[PDB]
Amino acid sequence: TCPFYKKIPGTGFTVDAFQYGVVEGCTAYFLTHFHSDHYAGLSKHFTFPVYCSEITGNLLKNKLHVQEQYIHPLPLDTECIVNGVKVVLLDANHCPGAVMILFYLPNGTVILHTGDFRADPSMERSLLADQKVHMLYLDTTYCSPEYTFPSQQEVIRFAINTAFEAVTLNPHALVVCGTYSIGKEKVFLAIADVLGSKVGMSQEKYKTLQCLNIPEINSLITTDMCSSLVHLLPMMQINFKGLQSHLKKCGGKYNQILAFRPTGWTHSNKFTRIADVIPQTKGNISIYGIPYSEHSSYLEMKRFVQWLKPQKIIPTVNVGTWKSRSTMEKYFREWKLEAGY
């Protein structure tokens, strides 16, 4: 059944709750972003109101074929009324079109649902600064102190410098980047920019990117693989067998592959710095795992929460085990006692 952490009390609303059939008593279904664990269940047969950002609504229409009459896009940073309740959508610093949602309940309670987010100090100067938030529905993906990672900026600098050096040493090297969802577009776009190439990809992936309102996108991507020396492939194909295979396909235009796998966290983060990352190499193929995250580190999450000072926290991630739930509740109490709320 629909879990309690997907329901907004005092409303007829649900958040990211599309795989339970008709939720009894739901008058409006919000969708925070276009990732499959969140939209799971939506299709052209859906006939209830879906509230979301403009970009998420472009992806619902073009990729899932949801009918336009049930898509209700809202602008960001704007007080809107939905079924009689004031809501605001805020940028979540996750993937394109990802939002946090502020609900102003008739009884005076204010609720923030983060969806998926990467907390950032810039959020402390949004509309969130203007009133007290009582309850926080929190993306707790990396809520444990082992989870450190560098800034997105540091990681993109590494990737750009690595690619540029490799291709300038060998003009017949191909760069490949893995993907299995929207997000992390900076990785492949930043690399293609430094090399003066467009990024080449499948017709399905190009269609997905043309939904994202990225400025000048027609100048940066293409379905012509032959003209491009940065290719995007399914994350599944980013291994030696898949890459050897791909290289055969290019007809001896290239003699070397440099590949990037933008992972979330991986246990080399506890020991090794970004400056010290190395690839796995077999023959003329090298694969780099780079820790490009679109979720809060532990310290970023802690700073946001200690700033916000909520009265109650409801985790939305890692909720399936008693050991995880208990560990998270221990950190929440530490944070509250340290900061004095």
Between helix 185-195 and helix 152-169 the angle, nearest 10°, is 40
99-104: strand order across its sheet: 80-82, 85-91, 99-104, 110-113, 135-138, 312-315
Nearer to Ni ion (CB atom), residue 116 or residue 185: 116
Shortest CB 60 distance to Ni ion, Å: 15
Q: Least distance to Ni ion from the beta carbon of 220, Å? A: 23
H-helix or E-strand spanning residue 55? helix 54-59
* Token pair of 105 as six digits: 């309940």
Beta pairing, strands 85-91 & 99-104? antiparallel
**139 Cβ partners below 8 Å, 6+ apart?**
114, 115, 116, 117, 295, 296, 316, 317
Query: Which of 35/205 has CB closer to Ni ion?
Result: 35
Strand bridging mode 85-91 / 80-82: antiparallel
Three-state DSSP class for residue 195: helix
| 74, 221, 261 from 55: Cα distances, Å | 10, 18, 25
Residues that bind Ni ion (CB under 5 A): 35, 116
Closer to Ni ion by CB, 91 or 193: give it.
Answer: 91
In terms of CB distance, is 89 or 259 closer to Ni ion? 89
Strands 110-113 and 80-82: unpaired
Q: Looking at beta carbons only, is 33 or 198 nearer to Ni ion? A: 33
Nearer to Ni ion, 185 or 256 (CB): 185
Shortest spacing between CB 214 and Ni ion, in angstroms: 18
In angstroms, give the least distance from the CB of 33 to Ni ion.
6
Shortest spacing between CB 34 and Ni ion, in angstroms? 9
Note whether 32 and 112 are within 8 A (CB): no
User: How many angstroms separate the CA atoms of 158 and 67, rounded?
Assistant: 42
Burial class (CB in 10 A: 0-12, 13-18, 19+), 278: exposed
Beta carbon of residue 57, minimum distance to Ni ion (angstroms, whole number)? 17
Least separation, in Å, of the C-beta of 40 and Ni ion?
12
Q: How far is the CB of 185 from Ni ion (least distance, A)?
A: 14
174 versus 294: smaller Cβ distance to Ni ion? 294
Which CB, 116 or 300, lies closer to Ni ion? 116
